């Protein structure tokens, strides 16, 4: 509970905004039939041109204002083109002599937008919102979008529009949406708002630097979230962890001034529990690499506050599930939180350590610390007697070379569970790709001295070798592992994505 | 046709062994229910012990010899276990009072062996064949295998047993003599017998690919490699055409010709065709990356771990396609037309080389800005793919040692497949299953396409920002196929067996099963 | 004499060489200290030490035939100065004839036998007194004990360090006059007199090697360096043959030819012979590594510390062998026949170069798999060693700037010697002692042999596992000498004087003492 400080100026909690200006936005969804009213703020049409690449903008919707209708005539609009993400917007007076702004965002020439296309269409909309004092935005869909992609549009808009000023020392109040078949989309709105905040909450924990967000203050934040949502919570400290013989996890934290803290939140439905799930997130608050210091070119030590992204995804999922309250499930949200540091007290390369299932592990590289903490977390998860264990983790830099920055990799011991994850990837619009656990590489983890090696010396397929290592810690339960090392941080925008909150929540709900 | 030389000691063709000692092995398959005769050479039982530890060895088969039968009693065998890859030798006198050698290889406790496990079994078998002058080997299957896995056992035995001595002169070979006979005992032998000569053809297509890949870049160059393809086409009665520089210039193959500019060997584009006698129901083009040495060009392979010493293998894709032409031309499938294509060249450093930054024009008119001369495979493939699509085929499959990133994604065991068509990808995955050459479907992520936008050219050769290079390479190749089902198999990680220091000949069987299944 | 090819008309077509140096004009007079020293024009330096007493006082013990100078040099005046090694002082006074004279001393420390390294320090101090002082004469008075070999070494070193190489100066010549006379006073002078002309010959052989080594690779290429060797043989009346590529192809020297494939200069193999007029009792071949520029080839020297800019020095072995030819041809030993060999070429990057992975055939028929084009010296030496053994000699000794690892093992002062014959290694070590060019015996460790086993060729050029690269090189070379006493001297660490930014001409005196004392 008490956060240790070196100097009195060291922060002792993570600042969190719960009430955000996005929560004050009043959303109305209208059917496009009957025509669109343009009375105030900014109205943006989402427009494509199928086949005709970079073709002219042509607005289909009737607008119940004569001045705006004249602006939206074909001869004016064709001066502009639909190239994905291209936008124009103009101020003008409407029928009432009132100043309105009217424009469009180009949606290209493919009928069905991918999540990546929709993010580009959203960023372009947010740019306008950031550069225009407005009380109201109205968005007219002249493109096809299913219910899930619509919700995704809203979540992305809310998340990209929100700006995080916690460490710095007027938003719209109304959103209107015109869309064909509007009634079918209305239930997405408040679900979007919930998903936005789980994602934004995860984002807040990830962006919070390692002097603010350390094992103590992160577990404290998790307890405060549990209290607000009425989840059961338990934080395990060093003495309990020693009792449980979590030697792999405790070894990683030996070099930190912050004591290890193991987070365990539980959601339990009111009636009968029919499925029990453990979600396990990697929770390294700062990964220096330890004695295997991140000193090689491209090792990105300055980004390593984000190594608790998996833990943050798990907590953002706890917010969504605690809010939406799925029935018939029991969900354990887990993270073995610690920091990986260089000290006289640190574990060393070569050390042999003993995990809570009795397996001795030879440490080949202190920078492969995530798999050690997850080993002990997985043994703990399995002892709960759950139906599914899913872990999420910024585990291997190799992901940038295999899937890159857009799609996370999923590995597991159970194809039905993998297919569930992939379905949740589909409906959350957070992309994941199934990657194999190749048993041929297992022999490269046979240690000469210990029961098992932490790392391969020979195999460069390190995401696969990591999965093989984790698999040794799950004996007889369906388990999947999501490596989010490549996807978690939005390098271009200099901010987290909060990747995985919606994926995991869609998994639990559906 | 004529191989240019710098000095008269420079080789002018690739040595190729067609009749190998493996071809001399007389193979006989007998049904195990008739019992086993143990009169001679070495007799090996393949034994497992299903779901049971490192359980004991117990022989199931009837053995038509009292002496041998007495030796193989459970009591005598109990001291030995079935651990995967272990083996034992026994020695005894048979009813004929003739000494015979008998033993076993352990096949584990899992009732179904993986491709990787079967290879471990075979390697153990080959150890017992090495350093033992034997006229005959007999293998008794006390484990069960489907026809595909039986064929794979034979193909693997043949390939692993064959020793390539083309480049030994003073350092042969002294004690190396092959068995002349192989006997196999298996249940329902009659259904397995067909697999024998199929395995023999598959072994040779893959060993032929291996011979081309292993041949160093002074032997195997664009001229001698295309000369070999011609000789292969002549032997198989395939139609063949090698396009030289003048014809490649006429076809405007600027991306391919740029790559070979700095080489002393003229570019040679290989085009062989197999056509079935009846109705042609399916037309397929198989395209192989054919870089006979990859120095990297002006982006020289000088970085730690860039493996320049290995770059003779950068024509492994072409070798697979030629190995497949051997299998297809030998098995003669019906209903198909198959084009076997490789844009062969060498990637060298010279006053004549293409440079980083050059803008070159592919044969479909797309201008390409070269961002790195070591991304050469995709440039040759771009013009080979334009060529392939002009043939009007149903499927185009390319195979290439294209990106070193494959080592970090799937590693050394599984190849990655990418494509623009789900049906075609699924046909490739099914061929992977039946050839037992492992492949894994990887995505073409369209979000990365924007990073190939060039300020000046129609497209960049490489990404500014994306490190997922195998995916970027796929997005690039996709720009060279307009309206045809296409898949791309990246064999950079799987082609060379780093432990055994020799090619695998990866792809030959996969591509042949693909053609045959269709 | 071949024509040197040029790219532009400004490319040089020969190496400039100075034969008649200012050192050759110096008249040397040796006098016995018992007669007293006469002190007149020029500069008279006493070499003084003080055994026991570190930095002890200077005391001049020789009789000086001049009352004024004797008064000046009395103990009372001299004791304010000390003998610290390399320390020096100048004195000015009027002698008994009222003529001003300059006198001084160099400290030789407090250890009674100076090492080769200590003597070099004394000589460097002496040279600084010669520089920037227009002197007609230097006189040196030995008040330290030196044996005949150390006396000679003093003179060789003095001559070598004093000589300034201005061949490539144009606008920046040192506006530098040399003494015309050198007087030496020493006890038992008659016994040292024979060392004077021997020192003068050894100086020139060393300085000649140095001129070849310092000549840049545009001046000293394989054609111009073999032409210089022809010219030297003509001057000394040695037999000579230069083998060109047609004859090298005929001899099947595939290893040597492969290295040179990338060069615009044809390979030239140098073969000089000295034979004594009497009955020949010993036949010796001296082989020098002759790479006129080592870029690394496709394994380009781009790694930090690869020192590509120093690689004109990669013919230092060849230079030492030609410097030896100079000494031998001049001093004319009896009862011996000596072959001076070098397989000269340039290691370059080109469409024509050999490649990592190429398999090439040496002249003894061994096939060699190229693992790294930057291990080119051992490939040229392989063929030169086969040629050398065919001559029917008693000893083969090669000398080469072969491995960078020498800098990590013995460093910049001692060369390493490896061999297959202890009697011959001991002879080299004895020559090292009497030449004062230090060498240390290093082992050829047979355990590493197995790491040169090639999967395809008869042998690997390089190890993939063993980092002891100098020993691995020696193992590889050993395979090319079948039945003859052989030794190998690796001078990679010792050839270039990094501090002084010039060659040492290392090996000339060592190899000459080897020849003479046999
Ligand atoms: C030594 C390796 C097998 C494991 C090692 N893993 C790690 O360092 C993880 O702890 C890193 N937190 C994963 C990572 C590294 C760089 C960028 C993004 C994400 C890695 O280098 O990938
Ligand atoms: C420049 C890069 C974007 C692409 C580059 N591609 C290449 O170098 C290919 O031409 C190489 N032939 C691929 C390769 C490299 C190392 C081991 C096996 C295979 C690579 O990454 O490997
Ligand atoms: C590839 C390696 C086993 C051998 C390699 N050898 C060479 O490069 C020789 O050809 C070089 N001439 C060795 C050298 C390097 C630096 C300073 C002095 C001498 C070396 O690095 O020493
Ligand atoms: Mg780490
Ligand atoms: Mg390349
Ligand atoms: Mg070299
Ligand atoms: Zn980490
Ligand atoms: Zn390549
Ligand atoms: Zn060299």
Q: How many domains does chain B have?
A: 2
Residue A43 C-beta-side C-alpha neighbours within 13 Å: 24
Look up residue C427 and give its two tokens. 């002879």
Q: Which helix (H) or strand (E) holds C226?
A: helix C222-236
Cβ-based neighbour number of residue A280 at 10 Å: 27
What is d(CA B355, CA B279) in angstroms, rounded to the nearest whole number? 48
Residue A436 lies in a domain: yes
What is d(CA A393, CA B79) in angstroms, rounded to the nearest whole number? 47
Contact (Cβ atoms closer than 8 angstroms) between residue A143 and residue A107: yes
Contact (Cβ atoms closer than 8 angstroms) between residue A82 and residue A108: yes
DSSP structural state of residue B454: -
- Closest listed residue to residue A32, CA positions, set A144, A123, A107: A144
Q: What angle do CA A412, A413, A416 make, to 5 degrees?
A: 85
- In the block, residue with structure tokens 């001393």: C105
Pairing between β-strand C336-347 and β-strand A42-47 as defined by DSSP bridges: unpaired
Q: Which helix (H) or strand (E) holds C200?
A: helix C194-214
- In the block, residue with structure tokens 């200006």: A21
CA–centroid distance, residue A406 to ligand 9 (Å): 48
Q: Which chains touch A (3 or more CB pairs under 8 A)?
A: B
Residues whose CB is less than 8 angstroms from the CB of residue C111 and which lie 6 or more positions away in sequence, other chains included:
C49, C51, C118
Statement to judge: residues A188 and A297 lie in one domain? no
Statement to judge: residues C414 and C494 lie in one domain? yes
What is d(CA B497, CA B489) in angstroms, rounded to the nearest whole number? 18
Look up residue A433 and give its two tokens. 């790709």
What is d(CA C204, CA C328) in angstroms, rounded to the nearest whole number? 12
What is d(CA A466, CA A473) in angstroms, rounded to the nearest whole number? 12
What is d(CA C516, CA C435) in angstroms, rounded to the nearest whole number? 11
Look up residue C409 and give its two tokens. 């093992």
Task: Give the C-alpha distances (Å, rounded to integers) separating C101 from A451, C38, C138.
Answer: 86, 11, 12
A335: domain CATH number?
3.40.630.10
- Closest listed residue to residue B426, CA positions, set B386, B395, B457: B395
The answer, yes or no, to whether C and A have at least 3 beta-carbon pairs within 8 Å is no
Statement to judge: residues C120 and C256 lie in one domain? no
Residue A463 C-beta-side C-alpha neighbours within 13 Å: 34
- Closest listed residue to residue A395, CA positions, set A346, A345, A465, A329: A465
Looking at ligand 1, which atom is closest to the CA of residue A367?
8
Statement to judge: residues C345 and C426 lie in one domain? yes
**Beta-ladder partners of A469:** none
Task: Give the C-alpha distances (Å, rounded to integers) separating B225 from B14, B236, B261, B291, B314.
Answer: 7, 17, 18, 10, 13
Which backbone phi and psi does B157 adopt, to 5 degrees?
A: -55, -50
What is d(CA B389, CA B370) in angstroms, rounded to the nearest whole number? 23
Residue B73 lies in a domain: yes
**Length of chain B in terms of residues written:** 518
Contact (Cβ atoms closer than 8 angstroms) between residue B497 and residue B413: no
Are C355 and B9 inside 8 Å of each other by CB?
A: no
The percent of chain B in helix, strand and coil, each rounded to the nearest 5, is 35, 20, 40
Q: What is the resolution of this structure in A?
A: 2.0
Which H, E and C letters describe C2-35, residue by residue?
CCCCCCCCCCCCCCCCCCCCHHHHCEEEEEEHHH
What is d(CA B494, CA B503) in angstroms, rounded to the nearest whole number? 9
Residues whose CB is less than 8 angstroms from the CB of residue A469 and which lie 6 or more positions away in sequence, other chains included:
A371, A375, A445, A452, A454, A455
User: What residues of B act catalytically?
Assistant: 301, 378
Residues 183-202 (A) with a CB less than 8 A from some CB of B: none
What is d(CA C504, CA C494) in angstroms, rounded to the nearest whole number? 8
What is d(CA C486, CA A111) in angstroms, rounded to the nearest whole number? 80
Residue ending a domain, among B216, B246, B278, is B216
Any ligand 2 atom below 6 A from CB of B315: no
Detail the DSSP E strand segments found in A142-293: 174-179, 232-236, 261-268, 275-281, 283-287
Q: What angle do CA C431, C433, C439 make, to 5 degrees?
A: 80
Residue A482 lies in a domain: yes
What is d(CA B194, CA B197) in angstroms, rounded to the nearest whole number? 7
Q: How far is CA C303 from the centre of its chain?
A: 28
Look up residue B207 and give its two tokens. 């060993």
Residue C2 lies in a domain: no
- Closest listed residue to residue A259, CA positions, set A289, A214, A318, A295: A214
Q: What is the separation, in whole angstroms, between the first and last Cα of chain A?
A: 35
- Closest listed residue to residue C369, CA positions, set C294, C258, C482, C249: C258
Residue B4 lies in a domain: no
Q: How far is CA A419 from the centre of its chain?
A: 20
Q: Exposed/middle/buried for B193, CB within 10 Å: 0-12, 13-18, 19+?
A: middle
- In the block, residue with structure tokens 């092959």: B178
Contact (Cβ atoms closer than 8 angstroms) between residue A118 and residue A59: no
Q: What is the separation, in whole angstroms, between the first and last Cα of chain C?
A: 33
Sheet (strand B459-460) strand order: B359-361, B367-369, B459-460
Q: Which helix (H) or strand (E) holds C323?
A: helix C316-331
Residue ending a domain, among A209, A238, A263, is A209
Which backbone phi and psi does B174 adopt, to 5 degrees?
A: -20, -60
Task: Give the C-alpha distances (Å, rounded to integers) separating A204 from A15, A166, A201, A207, A221.
Answer: 8, 9, 5, 5, 11
Detail the DSSP E strand segments found in B187-300: 239-243, 268-275, 282-288, 290-294
Q: Read out DSSP for A297-366? A: TT--GGGGGGGGHHHHHHHHHHHHHHHH--SSEEEEEEEEEEEE--STTS--TT-EEE-TTS-EEE-S-T
What is d(CA B140, CA B126) in angstroms, rounded to the nearest whole number? 15
Look up residue C184 and give its two tokens. 């030496």
Look up residue A452 and give its two tokens. 């098992």
The percent of chain C in helix, strand and coil, each rounded to the nearest 5, is 35, 20, 45
Statement to judge: residues A423 and A280 lie in one domain? yes
Radius of gyration, CA atoms only, chain A: 25
- Please give the method by which this entry was determined: X-ray
Contact (Cβ atoms closer than 8 angstroms) between residue B252 and residue B363: yes
Q: Which helix (H) or strand (E) holds C202?
A: helix C194-214
Residue B7 lies in a domain: no
- In the block, residue with structure tokens 């490939």: C379
Task: Give the C-alpha distances (Å, rounded to integers) separating C491 from B429, C314, C317, C512.
Answer: 58, 10, 8, 16
Look up residue A290 and give its two tokens. 């330890």
- Closest listed residue to residue C262, CA positions, set C380, C343, C348, C379: C348
**Beta-ladder partners of C417:** C441, C489
Q: Which chains touch C (3 or more CB pairs under 8 A)?
A: B
Which backbone phi and psi does C54 adopt, to 5 degrees?
A: -55, 125
What is d(CA A390, CA A279) in angstroms, rounded to the nearest whole number? 5
What is d(CA C162, CA C139) in angstroms, rounded to the nearest whole number? 15
What is d(CA A283, CA A214) in angstroms, rounded to the nearest whole number? 10
Contact (Cβ atoms closer than 8 angstroms) between residue C348 and residue C297: yes
Statement to judge: residues A163 and A215 lie in one domain? no
Pairing between β-strand B502-503 and β-strand C496-497 as defined by DSSP bridges: unpaired
Q: Which helix (H) or strand (E) holds A141?
A: strand A136-141
Q: What angle do CA C22, C24, C25 make, to 5 degrees?
A: 70
Statement to judge: residues A159 and A236 lie in one domain? no
DSSP structural state of residue C484: S
What is d(CA A203, CA A157) in angstroms, rounded to the nearest whole number? 15
Looking at ligand 3, which atom is closest to the CA of residue C463?
3
Task: Give the C-alpha distances (Å, rounded to integers) separating A264 from A324, A337, A380.
Answer: 20, 11, 10
Task: Give the C-alpha distances (Å, rounded to integers) separating C148 from A78, A114, C517.
Answer: 102, 91, 15
The angle, 0 to 180 degrees and rounded to 10, between the axes of the packed helices A147-161 and A415-428 is: 70
Statement to judge: residues A299 and A400 lie in one domain? yes
Statement to judge: residues C461 and C504 lie in one domain? yes
Residue C388 lies in a domain: yes
B85: domain CATH number?
3.40.220.10
Residues whose CB is less than 8 angstroms from the CB of residue C59 and which lie 6 or more positions away in sequence, other chains included:
C48, C50, C75, C78, C79
CA–centroid distance, residue C419 to ligand 9 (Å): 20
Pairing between β-strand C459-460 and β-strand C367-369 as defined by DSSP bridges: parallel
Task: Give the C-alpha distances (Å, rounded to integers) separating B119 from B101, B126, B152, B159.
Answer: 23, 10, 9, 11
- In the block, residue with structure tokens 């000794």: C397
Q: Exposed/middle/buried for B342, CB within 10 Å: 0-12, 13-18, 19+?
A: buried
- In the block, residue with structure tokens 């390369």: A349
**Beta-ladder partners of A333:** A265, A279
Cβ-based neighbour number of residue A47 at 10 Å: 25
- In the block, residue with structure tokens 């391919």: B256
Residue C15 lies in a domain: no
Active-site position among A120, A294, A305, A420: A294
Residue ending a domain, among C192, C216, C240, is C216
Any ligand 2 atom below 6 A from CB of B294: yes
Residues whose CB is less than 8 angstroms from the CB of residue B356 and which lie 6 or more positions away in sequence, other chains included:
B298, B299, B370, B371, B372, B373
> Among this protein's residues, is A276 annotated catalytic?
no
Q: Which residues form the domain of A53? A: 19-209
Coil vs helix vs strand at B38: coil
- Closest listed residue to residue A264, CA positions, set A294, A291, A244, A290: A244
B vs C, Cβ pairs < 8 A, gives 97
- Closest listed residue to residue B374, CA positions, set B311, B313, B294, B304: B294
Q: Does A144 touch chain B (CB under 8 A)?
A: no
Are C455 and B502 inside 8 Å of each other by CB?
A: yes
Q: Which helix (H) or strand (E) holds A509?
A: helix A501-509
Residue C414 C-beta-side C-alpha neighbours within 13 Å: 13
Q: Which helix (H) or strand (E) holds B108?
A: none
- Closest listed residue to residue A141, CA positions, set A92, A176, A109: A176
Statement to judge: residues A235 and A365 lie in one domain? yes
- Closest listed residue to residue B355, CA positions, set B376, B370, B366: B370
Look up residue A50 and give its two tokens. 């199928």
**Length of chain C in terms of residues written:** 518
Contact (Cβ atoms closer than 8 angstroms) between residue C207 and residue C163: yes
Q: Does C7 touch chain B (CB under 8 A)?
A: no
What is d(CA B480, CA C139) in angstroms, rounded to the nearest whole number? 85
Instruction: Encode burial over B102-115: b for 16+ CB neighbours within 10 A, e otherwise.
Output: bbbbbbbbeeebeb
Pairing between β-strand A99-106 and β-strand A87-93 as defined by DSSP bridges: antiparallel
Residue whose CB lies within 8 A of the most ligand 1 atoms, among A396, A398, A456, for a mutation test: A396
Look up residue C438 and give its two tokens. 């230090």
Which backbone phi and psi does C14 adopt, to 5 degrees?
A: -165, 160
What is d(CA C185, CA C200) in angstroms, rounded to the nearest whole number? 18
Detail the DSSP E strand segments found in C421-462: 439-441, 459-460
Look up residue B208 and give its two tokens. 């032929």
Cβ-based neighbour number of residue C193 at 10 Å: 14
The beta-carbon neighbor of B302 closest among C302, C355, C456 is C302
Distance from A369 to chain B by nearest Cα, in Å? 19
Q: What is the separation, in whole angstroms, between the first and last Cα of chain B?
A: 35
Phi-psi region of C127 (alpha: psi -120 to 50; beta: other; left: phi over 0): alpha
Residues of B in contact with A425 (CB under 8 A): none
What is d(CA A4, CA A313) in angstroms, rounded to the nearest whole number? 25
What is d(CA B241, CA A218) in angstroms, rounded to the nearest whole number? 69
Q: How far is CA B37 from the centre of its chain?
A: 36
What is d(CA B222, CA B315) in angstroms, rounded to the nearest whole number? 10
Pairing between β-strand C137-142 and β-strand C181-186 as defined by DSSP bridges: parallel
Statement to judge: residues B200 and B267 lie in one domain? no
Look up residue B99 and give its two tokens. 């000494």
The angle, 0 to 180 degrees and rounded to 10, between the axes of the packed helices C422-435 and C148-162 is: 70
Residues of A in contact with B471 (CB under 8 A): 403-404
- Closest listed residue to residue C261, CA positions, set A483, B464, A457, B11: B11
Look up residue B168 and give its two tokens. 């030994």
CA–centroid distance, residue C267 to ligand 9 (Å): 15
Residues of B in contact with A404 (CB under 8 A): 445, 448, 466-468, 471
Statement to judge: residues A201 and A220 lie in one domain? no
Residue A473 C-beta-side C-alpha neighbours within 13 Å: 33
Contact (Cβ atoms closer than 8 angstroms) between residue A73 and residue A58: no
């Amino acid at each position: 509970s008490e956060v240790p400080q070196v100097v009195s100026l060291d922060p002792t909690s993570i600042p969190i905004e719960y009430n955000t200006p996005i929560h004050d936005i009043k959303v109305q969804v209208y059917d496009i039939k009957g025509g669109c009213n343009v009375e105030e703020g900014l109205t943006i049409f989402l427009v494509n041109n199928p086949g005709k690449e970079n073709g002219p903008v042509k607005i289909s919707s009737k607008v119940n204002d004569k001045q705006v209708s004249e602006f939206l005539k074909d001869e004016n609009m064709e001066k502009f083109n639909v190239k994905l993400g291209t936008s124009k917007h103009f101020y003008m007076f409407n029928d009432n002599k009132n100043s309105v702004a009217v424009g469009y965002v180009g949606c290209g020439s493919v009928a069905d937008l991918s999540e990546a296309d929709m993010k580009r269409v959203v960023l372009s909309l947010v740019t306008m919102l950031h550069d225009n004092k407005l009380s109201k935005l109205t968005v007219v869909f002249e493109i096809n979008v299913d219910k899930n992609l619509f919700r995704f549009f809203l979540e992305t808009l809310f998340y990209e529009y929100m700006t995080d000023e916690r460490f710095k020392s007027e938003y719209i109040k109304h959103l209107g949406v015109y869309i064909n078949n509007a009634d079918t989309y209305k239930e997405e709105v408040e679900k979007a708002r919930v998903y936005y905040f789980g994602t934004y909450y995860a984002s807040q924990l990830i962006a919070a630097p390692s002097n603010y967000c350390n094992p103590v203050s992160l577990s404290n934040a998790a307890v405060e979230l549990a209290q607000k949502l009425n989840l059961e919570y338990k934080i395990l400290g060093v003495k309990e962890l020693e009792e449980l013989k979590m030697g792999a996890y405790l070894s990683v934290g030996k070099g930190s001034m912050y004591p290890n803290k193991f987070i365990h939140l539980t959601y339990k439905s009111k009636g009968d529990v029919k499925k029990k799930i453990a979600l396990v997130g990697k929770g390294i608050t700062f990964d220096s690499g330890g004695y295997n210091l991140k000193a090689a070119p491209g090792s990105m030590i300055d980004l390593m506050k984000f190594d608790m992204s998996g833990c943050a995804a798990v907590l953002g999922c706890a917010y969504c599930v605690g809010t939406l309250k799925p029935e018939n499930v029991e969900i354990h949200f887990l993270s073995a939180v610690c920091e990986n540091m260089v000290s006289k007290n640190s574990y060393r390369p070569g050390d042999i350590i003993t995990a809570s299932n009795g397996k001795t592990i030879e440490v080949g590289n202190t920078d492969a610390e995530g798999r050690l903490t997850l080993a002990d977390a997985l043994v703990y998860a399995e002892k709960l007697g759950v139906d599914y264990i899913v872990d999420i983790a910024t585990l291997t830099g190799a992901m940038l070379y295999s899937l890159g920055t857009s799609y996370a990799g999923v590995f597991g011991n159970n194809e039905e569970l993998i297919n569930k994850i992939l379905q949740s990837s589909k409906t959350s619009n957070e992309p994941v790709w199934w990657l194999p656990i190749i048993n041929e590489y297992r022999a490269t983890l046979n240690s000469k001295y210990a029961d098992i090696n932490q790392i391969s010396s020979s195999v460069k397929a390190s995401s696969i070798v990591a999965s093989l290592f984790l698999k040794e810690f799950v004996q007889n339960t369906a388990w999947a592992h999501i490596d989010i090392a490549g996807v978690s941080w939005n390098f271009k925008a200099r901010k987290p994505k909060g990747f995985g909150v919606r994926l995991l929540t869609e998994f639990v709900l559906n």
